[PDB]
């Protein structure tokens, strides 16, 4: 699940059988860290038309 964005901690909990999460759209909302088993949230960094 490649991509780019800001990786920050969140408040949602994942059962110990699931993987990276999604949202109402078809984008990757959150991912499960396969190293420390921590819940991380994916937020794309700020962008906008000048």
């Amino acid at each position: 699940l490649t991509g780019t964005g800001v990786l920050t901690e969140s408040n949602k909990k994942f059962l110990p059988f699931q993987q990276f999460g999604r949202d109402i759209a078809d984008t990757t909302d959150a991912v499960r860290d396969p190293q420390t088993l921590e819940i991380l949230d994916i937020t794309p960094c700020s962008f906008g038309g000048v």
């Binding site: 780019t4 990786l7 860290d33 396969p34 190293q35 962008f47 906008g48 038309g49 000048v50």
Partner: protein, 49 residues
Amino acid sequence: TKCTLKSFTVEKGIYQTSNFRVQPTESIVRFPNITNLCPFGEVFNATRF
């Protein structure tokens, strides 16, 4: 502004020129731990062949 408007004289008002976007710096490789290690030690460094 003068470039995107194709004119040297620009009047008042708002004008969009381009799209600002923060670019990444480095990459992060995330993979699970190395647990199911192949028993290569007992193959090459064996007691009997």
